[PDB]
Amino acid sequence: MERIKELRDLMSQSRTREILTKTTVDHIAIIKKYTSGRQEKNPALRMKWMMAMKYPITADKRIMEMIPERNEQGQTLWSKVMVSSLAVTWWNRNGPTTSTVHYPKVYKTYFEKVERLKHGTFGPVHFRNQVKIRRRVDVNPGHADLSAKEAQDVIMEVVFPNEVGARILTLTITKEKKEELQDCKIAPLMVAYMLERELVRKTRFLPVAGGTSSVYIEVLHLTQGTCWEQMYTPGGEVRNDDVDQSLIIAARNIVRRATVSTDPLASLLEMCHSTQIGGIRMVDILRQNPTEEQAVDICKAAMGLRISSSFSFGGFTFKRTSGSSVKKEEEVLTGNLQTLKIRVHEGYEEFTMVGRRATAILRKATRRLIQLIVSGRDEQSIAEAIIVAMVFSQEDCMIKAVRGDLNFVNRANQRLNPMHQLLRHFQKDAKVLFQNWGIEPIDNVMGMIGILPDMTPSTEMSLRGVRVSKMGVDEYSSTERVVVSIDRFLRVRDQRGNVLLSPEEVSETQGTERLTITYSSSMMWEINGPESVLV
Amino acid sequence: MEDFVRQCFNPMIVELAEKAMKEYGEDPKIETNKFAAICTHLEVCFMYSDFH
Amino acid sequence: MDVNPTLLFLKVPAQNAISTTFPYTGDPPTGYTMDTVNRTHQYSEKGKWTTNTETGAPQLNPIDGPLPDNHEPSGYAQTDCVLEAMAFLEESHPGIFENSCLETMEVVQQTRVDKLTQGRQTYDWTLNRNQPAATALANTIEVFRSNDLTANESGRLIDFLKDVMESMDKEEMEITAHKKKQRLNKKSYLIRALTLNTTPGMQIRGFVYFVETLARSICEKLEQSGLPVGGNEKKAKLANVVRKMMTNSQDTELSFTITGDNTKWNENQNPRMFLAMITYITRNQPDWFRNVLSIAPIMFSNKMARLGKGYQIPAEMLANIDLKYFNESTRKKIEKIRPLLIDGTASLSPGMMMGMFNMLSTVLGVSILNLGQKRYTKTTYWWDGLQSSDDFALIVNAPNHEGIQAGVDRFYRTCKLVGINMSKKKSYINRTGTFEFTSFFYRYGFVANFSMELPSFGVSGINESADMSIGVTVIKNNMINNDLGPATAQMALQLFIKDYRYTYRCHRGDTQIQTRRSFELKKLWEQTRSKAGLLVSDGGPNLYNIRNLHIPEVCLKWELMDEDYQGRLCNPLNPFVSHKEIESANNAGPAKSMEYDAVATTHSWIPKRNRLEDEQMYQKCCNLFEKFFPSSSYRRPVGISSMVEAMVSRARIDARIDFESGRIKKEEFAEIMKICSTIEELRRQ
Amino acid sequence: EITGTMRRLADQSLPPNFSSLENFRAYVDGFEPNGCIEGKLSQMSKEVNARIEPFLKTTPRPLRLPDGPPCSQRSKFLLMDALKLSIEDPSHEGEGIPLYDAIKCMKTFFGWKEPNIIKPHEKGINPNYLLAWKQVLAELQDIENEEKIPKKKNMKKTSQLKWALGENMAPEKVDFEDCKDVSDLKQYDSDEPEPRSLASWIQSEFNKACELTDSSWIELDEIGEDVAPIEHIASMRRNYFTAEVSHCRATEYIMKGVYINTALLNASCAAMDDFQLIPMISKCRTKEGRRKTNLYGFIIKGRSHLRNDTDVVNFVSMEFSLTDPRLEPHKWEKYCVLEIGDMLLRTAIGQVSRPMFLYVRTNGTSKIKMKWGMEMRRCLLQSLQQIESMIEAESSVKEKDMTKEFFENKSETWPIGESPKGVEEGSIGKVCRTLLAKSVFNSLYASPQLEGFSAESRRLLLIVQALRDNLEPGTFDLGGLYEAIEECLINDPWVLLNASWFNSFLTHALR
């Protein structure tokens, strides 16, 4: 009866009966935000005044049999339920000591950071005009990369089972939590809040100076500054930087395998519906994991999920920055007496291309390349970037640089479209193009040095439109979620008929599994162990 | 609604919604409530039909 | 000898220490409204007079009027020029507006009424005064419930908008006073609904949110509009565009850079031009969408400015008086403003208040920037720049030092064409490589002196643990977000430490200075062996430094405490915790609050009592519901049934479960269930 | 839909060539991006243009300056002239009661001469001031007779003091409908102020503001152990700056404003109905390290019916001094002075016995006015960061950042002064305290004219700095910028000293 009488005497006033009748439960969040909102009268000054005054604290009435009125020096700390501050410190010294010290199992999200700082070996501070990399990373470290809703449902189950949501489907985390803290409840609302802090992901956009994981971000204020930087290795690793890698490799190998299938789309679909990753189905991971990569984007597209409007090419993901596209089919002659019809994009465009190890900005008119600004790590990376750039230039200058017949097929011996053919021809050797491109004298301005065909930096001369950037070009992961139209051949055409994604830029160095993955749909076992094939 | 609809349903009902909307050219981008209602009706009929 | 600090600049260039010119950290300490009216209506006096048909307030419509005659600021813009520039921008971006409109449609689909509360003070016409958000919202809802207009009960904001429309459709509107239910003719209702202050009215706010949301989905996809981001991000947007202009091979091109502002910008933006650009953004879009996103500009087309108090001489008495009882200046101003006002409200057609359409103004500025990418210029000169509401930065490049002035001329001309009166005063030129942009400064380097309002290093004042962590958290945030030096963070930290110690009358037990509390603290200090492990609130040494500004105090000292110390401290069986509000800081712009661990930290309580105005309606119900279901404080609940149909059933199940095996007397149970049946019988009618 | 009472405004919202908004929507939907811009340019006059005007090193003219009465002082409290009451009393600061910590300050002086009025308000009944002063002494000696010591003494509602605070000074609150056809019903004057010309004393006060004393004035709280990379660097920055500015007199100024405004507000909450006494207390630590308490004067508070934050409360200040007002009279326009006695002043050869004076003024404040002053320690941070900024920007160009070499090299000199028509170079700590005092005075003398001047000086200084780098800048409306500057220059003496600083800087900017 403790509670309901307030409801009854609340149902006494008709203007309250009406609101208690009409508004429904789905709307309670919309009504708790109806507050006067005036008691914001300088919390500093009100706090100071209330601290000067005795007894600002509200306790329960059960302090009588727990703490005394007179302290060990005869100090008054009660009223007639108000309590002064000294009672806290007295109880802070000598009271009911308790073995509830098992606390560091719900607050592990903090003591993980503590331990990371414990063995967190440091390094020297090499000051430098640090350049901001416009990257996007997570905020919570080691949270298994779980979305908010699928995590808060488990939360609601573990903390308030007597009012769980209607999701009853029949992950042992439920069992582990219900067992380790069954009768050792601490503070319900705070327990659930801190668990939501521990497990729920959230990833957004920040300028960083080399920090990859989340652990390199929670200590950003130590690392990053105006013109300084401090390398600090916490001595550890999390899931969010090495869980998605397993799905990446599994989808890359799945696409590598799907080409030989008659209808690669159907085999891929059965694979994705059957394949299990870390005990979790791959389909749900695709629906919930925001990782951007060709294989993952294509597998998501097969289930009709929006991705970024990218003109992915040369291993480099592209993004529309400005400019329009016009078809303008055209004839082309090779260096070995061969005719080729190709889709020369008409109109003006301006793009920013992001790569695995490099980035660049480009402006492009009708068969015109201008202002190519590149930044990479290795000589090989800037080499590949400049190569795919000159391929994309579509000038006749690169047209002249064709040597040998052009026969490059899929792993199923299938004729590839000409762009990828040129790319794969130049990737092994493309030194001949620079010597026949043209050189221009530069002025050594703004820390932008030139590059020569022999892969040598130079001061006062460079290629036409080329620029070597320092410590990274400004990335931008534009947010777009647009529908796509995949075909039966694992080709991607969103709305305009432009080839977006294709299984020609999918492979790199050997795949090394971290997460244990299992396929169950179709053959897809010629790679796994032979004993695995039998069993 | 739209992205959730693509989350909680099969692509075959998606293609059926495509075909039924093309019957009158009903653009899904606007008739999102019609999108949900039609996918609902289809899956209702199906789970009424299974194992009978 | 005499001392001069400014002479310092003979040794160190200005951009390295311009912060010395920033004097203050915060902000230092009814007639100006007439000055604003005269200023706006002077920049638009071209005989566009039309007495309103539904307000009777004469209105000037200076759009597409004569071209500027004098060099002085002017508010004349031709419609076709603006729309042509907008279409030119879309020619620079394919259908991107429809993507932004799709995000906006998603918003208008999910958005409930709550997003009307997170914001600054509003204006309620129920009391004809500025009031907080929920006050005006609750009074409006209850006066709507006074009549049949009750669509808002669905909860979706669009239904609130339909309620607003139907309210405009009704002639008589009974205003209850707290009784005296007699006021508010139709005409005065229309007039007051359009009343503006300094600060939107009640109805338009939701709509402006929609418009502003649109700008977000636009501006996030535009590089030349870097307003919505905060601090560090803008840094990058400074170096990229530079490379797009000065990094040109065979550098015979000459790149100049100006940083300018637009004097009296905000008083010139005519809402009808906004109507036009919105409509073009809604090209062949669904009808009702055009109807909804066109509300706010139309409401601003006929908007009234409130005066309020006056000098006593209430504002609504400025109609029957002779112009001799005043000074010369007031006499002249009233002469030039007298017939324009009606019903204690000033008539302001071409106006716009600073802080309303700043993001759409940035859209317009990025448009006038986009109009010069050597594809709409057909000339040698080509420019690009970064835009804000009023303070913009431009880089114009031309290969010859003679035509650069022609490019700057085209910029200023086209800006005059769209109502952008470029301030000749608050503007300065130099060679590319060093400039200003909204308190940002670039001389081969960065500085974030826009939001460099060093934090309230004083305590936030709710707790002993949450307050410390909140202070140090804002320290770290302004350390990375509103970039400041590290040693400045150290000084602000130790200042906060002293302020927090002296706020809770607890310095430490190693210094003999004595509070009304230090005795017990020193006794604790004595009986503890591991001294460092003690909390700061419990007389502990401050060892918070840069490397651990994020770890809460509790977890950091957690190992170094004594076993009994922890077993007594973190014990949640403490009698001080009472289940009420937590985490609510909500500082005004968004409202952010990031608190951390709490154990036996319940200090700052009992804020004084202060028992239409009857706030005792909503929060009572919500708190009672929370008292029934704790989950209401963590996850947005999910349920269709009515409040009572859930609470009664829950109470019956609770009585059942704690009677059968629990602890309750059968008579108390029977009375509980009889009371529940009484509730049921009362809810049936 | 958009029905009547709404569409009626929508079709009334269109530009002046249309009738209904539906025709407008059709006209916008079907649009011709034909390029009317070129024709509009061809139609507009050639005079409407941003004709770039150059900016050469011979263009900058020194700023104009107001002429007329010398600049008085509106500072809330005294800068250098006030005198301390050294007690060296370590009362453990057990919330050391500020009134009874002041009765001993009073007990520690002898030679309280008869109150001798020297400099009046130049207008008004002055004897009320000295009557209030003797009443202060009376209530200071009428305490032990009320059987109980009261922790604060509520001054009597006395007529001379009622006039000093203007509590009795109140007009009629009359509705206009009653006071009809009145002869003196003309408006309030509300005249804009007169241009107060520059005087020479503000620079001397600023000079004395940057000097060092023998007291410490600070308790900079402890910091945890410093790890190798930066915490050591952050230490060797902040602690060196502290030791170079710890004992600065501007610290005393900040603490003075803090304590006075703090006591005023903390009583204004609880003295909500009656008068109270306000001791102007400061604290410091001796060179031998003993907590010393100083007293500067007394202040009497008016009514504190503070409903809102901008609510005005009048107050009266009486500050001690050894600076004779008879020296420079025009400085103290708002002040009335009393020859109050003689004090001992020890020298290398005995005492000198200089007279003691009491400066009294009437002013007003409010809640926000005080809290801007309870947080004046901010002027420290603004200083350090505007030092720390230079520690990074000018040291951005280095592999090993120039941080310790910023200090630790006295050969590095900073041009800071020019008295004998010659550039005077100084060391670091003088600059550190100089910037601290800059932010301090800007905070306490905070005036909107200073805001406007800073805004308009940033532009001119940036342009001159660009020209010094030989980057051929230009302007748009130079006369207009001078016009705005002169428009933001009336009476603030701090502003005027900054202006003369700026002019001498441009003269010494090698331009």
PDB file of C-alpha atoms in Angstrom, chain A residues 87-220:
ATOM      1  CA  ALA A  87      28.897  11.965   9.568  1.00  0.00           C
ATOM      2  CA  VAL A  88      30.175  10.820   6.159  1.00  0.00           C
ATOM      3  CA  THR A  89      33.844  11.069   7.196  1.00  0.00           C
ATOM      4  CA  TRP A  90      33.202   9.424  10.569  1.00  0.00           C
ATOM      5  CA  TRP A  91      31.389   6.546   8.857  1.00  0.00           C
ATOM      6  CA  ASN A  92      34.212   6.623   6.305  1.00  0.00           C
ATOM      7  CA  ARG A  93      36.641   5.594   9.064  1.00  0.00           C
ATOM      8  CA  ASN A  94      34.881   3.068  11.300  1.00  0.00           C
ATOM      9  CA  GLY A  95      31.627   1.327  10.458  1.00  0.00           C
ATOM     10  CA  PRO A  96      30.402  -1.988   9.085  1.00  0.00           C
ATOM     11  CA  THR A  97      33.455  -3.190   7.158  1.00  0.00           C
ATOM     12  CA  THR A  98      32.211  -5.537   4.460  1.00  0.00           C
ATOM     13  CA  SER A  99      33.758  -8.104   2.143  1.00  0.00           C
ATOM     14  CA  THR A 100      31.720  -6.642  -0.796  1.00  0.00           C
ATOM     15  CA  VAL A 101      35.194  -5.607  -1.914  1.00  0.00           C
ATOM     16  CA  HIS A 102      34.529  -7.984  -4.832  1.00  0.00           C
ATOM     17  CA  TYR A 103      33.360  -4.724  -6.524  1.00  0.00           C
ATOM     18  CA  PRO A 104      36.027  -4.864  -9.327  1.00  0.00           C
ATOM     19  CA  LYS A 105      33.869  -7.157 -11.440  1.00  0.00           C
ATOM     20  CA  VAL A 106      31.209  -4.594 -12.429  1.00  0.00           C
ATOM     21  CA  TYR A 107      33.733  -1.710 -12.647  1.00  0.00           C
ATOM     22  CA  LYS A 108      36.224  -3.669 -14.768  1.00  0.00           C
ATOM     23  CA  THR A 109      35.818  -1.031 -17.504  1.00  0.00           C
ATOM     24  CA  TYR A 110      37.919   1.308 -15.317  1.00  0.00           C
ATOM     25  CA  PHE A 111      40.451  -1.113 -13.830  1.00  0.00           C
ATOM     26  CA  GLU A 112      41.223  -2.275 -17.357  1.00  0.00           C
ATOM     27  CA  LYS A 113      42.419   1.290 -18.024  1.00  0.00           C
ATOM     28  CA  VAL A 114      44.246   1.238 -14.683  1.00  0.00           C
ATOM     29  CA  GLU A 115      46.101  -1.962 -15.628  1.00  0.00           C
ATOM     30  CA  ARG A 116      46.829  -0.495 -19.072  1.00  0.00           C
ATOM     31  CA  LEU A 117      48.547   2.400 -17.306  1.00  0.00           C
ATOM     32  CA  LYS A 118      50.320   0.041 -14.878  1.00  0.00           C
ATOM     33  CA  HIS A 119      52.554  -1.640 -17.481  1.00  0.00           C
ATOM     34  CA  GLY A 120      52.050   1.255 -19.899  1.00  0.00           C
ATOM     35  CA  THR A 121      55.662   1.748 -20.960  1.00  0.00           C
ATOM     36  CA  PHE A 122      56.366   5.259 -22.269  1.00  0.00           C
ATOM     37  CA  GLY A 123      58.680   6.803 -24.846  1.00  0.00           C
ATOM     38  CA  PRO A 124      60.323  10.108 -25.767  1.00  0.00           C
ATOM     39  CA  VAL A 125      58.496  13.310 -26.734  1.00  0.00           C
ATOM     40  CA  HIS A 126      59.617  14.114 -30.272  1.00  0.00           C
ATOM     41  CA  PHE A 127      57.928  17.486 -30.772  1.00  0.00           C
ATOM     42  CA  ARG A 128      56.593  18.193 -34.260  1.00  0.00           C
ATOM     43  CA  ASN A 129      53.932  20.204 -36.076  1.00  0.00           C
ATOM     44  CA  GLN A 130      51.543  17.297 -35.680  1.00  0.00           C
ATOM     45  CA  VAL A 131      49.032  16.963 -38.518  1.00  0.00           C
ATOM     46  CA  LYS A 132      45.446  15.990 -37.706  1.00  0.00           C
ATOM     47  CA  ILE A 133      44.207  12.813 -39.428  1.00  0.00           C
ATOM     48  CA  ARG A 134      40.432  13.026 -39.896  1.00  0.00           C
ATOM     49  CA  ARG A 135      39.743   9.417 -38.900  1.00  0.00           C
ATOM     50  CA  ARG A 136      36.783   7.624 -37.296  1.00  0.00           C
ATOM     51  CA  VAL A 137      37.323   5.314 -34.314  1.00  0.00           C
ATOM     52  CA  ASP A 138      35.494   3.794 -31.338  1.00  0.00           C
ATOM     53  CA  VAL A 139      35.309   5.224 -27.820  1.00  0.00           C
ATOM     54  CA  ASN A 140      34.820   2.152 -25.681  1.00  0.00           C
ATOM     55  CA  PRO A 141      37.750  -0.297 -25.435  1.00  0.00           C
ATOM     56  CA  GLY A 142      37.265  -4.054 -25.437  1.00  0.00           C
ATOM     57  CA  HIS A 143      33.479  -4.328 -25.785  1.00  0.00           C
ATOM     58  CA  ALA A 144      33.226  -7.184 -28.349  1.00  0.00           C
ATOM     59  CA  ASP A 145      31.857  -4.655 -30.913  1.00  0.00           C
ATOM     60  CA  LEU A 146      28.165  -4.892 -30.028  1.00  0.00           C
ATOM     61  CA  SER A 147      25.388  -2.507 -31.018  1.00  0.00           C
ATOM     62  CA  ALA A 148      23.331  -0.571 -28.486  1.00  0.00           C
ATOM     63  CA  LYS A 149      19.972  -2.361 -28.815  1.00  0.00           C
ATOM     64  CA  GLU A 150      21.201  -5.979 -28.901  1.00  0.00           C
ATOM     65  CA  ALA A 151      23.255  -5.132 -25.786  1.00  0.00           C
ATOM     66  CA  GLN A 152      20.607  -3.226 -23.815  1.00  0.00           C
ATOM     67  CA  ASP A 153      18.182  -6.129 -24.291  1.00  0.00           C
ATOM     68  CA  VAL A 154      20.658  -8.424 -22.499  1.00  0.00           C
ATOM     69  CA  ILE A 155      21.127  -5.664 -19.910  1.00  0.00           C
ATOM     70  CA  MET A 156      17.379  -5.412 -19.253  1.00  0.00           C
ATOM     71  CA  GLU A 157      17.238  -9.203 -18.944  1.00  0.00           C
ATOM     72  CA  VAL A 158      20.123  -9.482 -16.477  1.00  0.00           C
ATOM     73  CA  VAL A 159      19.105  -6.548 -14.237  1.00  0.00           C
ATOM     74  CA  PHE A 160      15.259  -6.614 -14.427  1.00  0.00           C
ATOM     75  CA  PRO A 161      14.226 -10.134 -15.497  1.00  0.00           C
ATOM     76  CA  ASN A 162      10.710  -9.738 -14.035  1.00  0.00           C
ATOM     77  CA  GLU A 163      10.038  -7.059 -16.705  1.00  0.00           C
ATOM     78  CA  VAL A 164      12.129  -8.212 -19.687  1.00  0.00           C
ATOM     79  CA  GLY A 165      11.216  -7.086 -23.190  1.00  0.00           C
ATOM     80  CA  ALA A 166       9.172  -9.265 -25.511  1.00  0.00           C
ATOM     81  CA  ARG A 167      12.336 -10.628 -27.172  1.00  0.00           C
ATOM     82  CA  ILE A 168      12.087 -14.292 -26.113  1.00  0.00           C
ATOM     83  CA  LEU A 169      13.931 -16.378 -28.717  1.00  0.00           C
ATOM     84  CA  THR A 170      16.468 -18.708 -27.007  1.00  0.00           C
ATOM     85  CA  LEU A 171      25.423 -15.252 -25.425  1.00  0.00           C
ATOM     86  CA  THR A 172      26.034 -17.248 -22.228  1.00  0.00           C
ATOM     87  CA  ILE A 173      26.953 -13.805 -20.848  1.00  0.00           C
ATOM     88  CA  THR A 174      23.445 -13.944 -19.374  1.00  0.00           C
ATOM     89  CA  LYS A 175      24.441 -17.061 -17.413  1.00  0.00           C
ATOM     90  CA  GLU A 176      27.827 -15.674 -16.358  1.00  0.00           C
ATOM     91  CA  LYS A 177      26.286 -12.444 -15.067  1.00  0.00           C
ATOM     92  CA  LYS A 178      23.327 -14.089 -13.323  1.00  0.00           C
ATOM     93  CA  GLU A 179      25.741 -16.489 -11.623  1.00  0.00           C
ATOM     94  CA  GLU A 180      28.674 -14.326 -10.526  1.00  0.00           C
ATOM     95  CA  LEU A 181      26.513 -11.569  -8.958  1.00  0.00           C
ATOM     96  CA  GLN A 182      23.266 -13.391  -8.121  1.00  0.00           C
ATOM     97  CA  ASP A 183      22.755 -12.395  -4.473  1.00  0.00           C
ATOM     98  CA  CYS A 184      25.633  -9.864  -4.422  1.00  0.00           C
ATOM     99  CA  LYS A 185      23.561  -7.012  -5.867  1.00  0.00           C
ATOM    100  CA  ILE A 186      25.225  -3.633  -5.396  1.00  0.00           C
ATOM    101  CA  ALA A 187      23.252  -0.693  -6.812  1.00  0.00           C
ATOM    102  CA  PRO A 188      20.765  -1.791  -9.520  1.00  0.00           C
ATOM    103  CA  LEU A 189      20.523   1.330 -11.664  1.00  0.00           C
ATOM    104  CA  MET A 190      24.245   2.090 -11.396  1.00  0.00           C
ATOM    105  CA  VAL A 191      25.093  -1.555 -12.190  1.00  0.00           C
ATOM    106  CA  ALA A 192      23.033  -1.485 -15.391  1.00  0.00           C
ATOM    107  CA  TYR A 193      24.315   1.977 -16.352  1.00  0.00           C
ATOM    108  CA  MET A 194      27.950   0.939 -15.960  1.00  0.00           C
ATOM    109  CA  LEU A 195      27.372  -2.289 -17.877  1.00  0.00           C
ATOM    110  CA  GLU A 196      25.942  -0.226 -20.745  1.00  0.00           C
ATOM    111  CA  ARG A 197      29.124   1.836 -20.466  1.00  0.00           C
ATOM    112  CA  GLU A 198      31.249  -1.328 -20.598  1.00  0.00           C
ATOM    113  CA  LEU A 199      29.681  -3.241 -23.494  1.00  0.00           C
ATOM    114  CA  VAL A 200      27.873  -0.855 -25.853  1.00  0.00           C
ATOM    115  CA  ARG A 201      29.868   0.422 -28.806  1.00  0.00           C
ATOM    116  CA  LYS A 202      29.933   3.954 -30.098  1.00  0.00           C
ATOM    117  CA  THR A 203      32.220   5.052 -32.915  1.00  0.00           C
ATOM    118  CA  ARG A 204      32.578   8.558 -34.280  1.00  0.00           C
ATOM    119  CA  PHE A 205      34.830  10.993 -36.092  1.00  0.00           C
ATOM    120  CA  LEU A 206      37.944  12.574 -34.557  1.00  0.00           C
ATOM    121  CA  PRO A 207      41.282  13.981 -35.710  1.00  0.00           C
ATOM    122  CA  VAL A 208      43.999  11.626 -34.441  1.00  0.00           C
ATOM    123  CA  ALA A 209      47.785  11.541 -34.766  1.00  0.00           C
ATOM    124  CA  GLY A 210      48.395   7.818 -35.247  1.00  0.00           C
ATOM    125  CA  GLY A 211      46.195   6.251 -32.576  1.00  0.00           C
ATOM    126  CA  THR A 212      44.469   3.147 -33.924  1.00  0.00           C
ATOM    127  CA  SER A 213      42.743   1.228 -31.123  1.00  0.00           C
ATOM    128  CA  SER A 214      40.496   2.577 -28.388  1.00  0.00           C
ATOM    129  CA  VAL A 215      43.288   2.282 -25.807  1.00  0.00           C
ATOM    130  CA  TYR A 216      45.345   4.778 -27.839  1.00  0.00           C
ATOM    131  CA  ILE A 217      42.317   7.118 -27.662  1.00  0.00           C
ATOM    132  CA  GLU A 218      41.399   7.100 -23.960  1.00  0.00           C
ATOM    133  CA  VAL A 219      44.980   8.344 -23.439  1.00  0.00           C
ATOM    134  CA  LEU A 220      44.803  10.818 -26.340  1.00  0.00           C
TER     135      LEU A 220
END
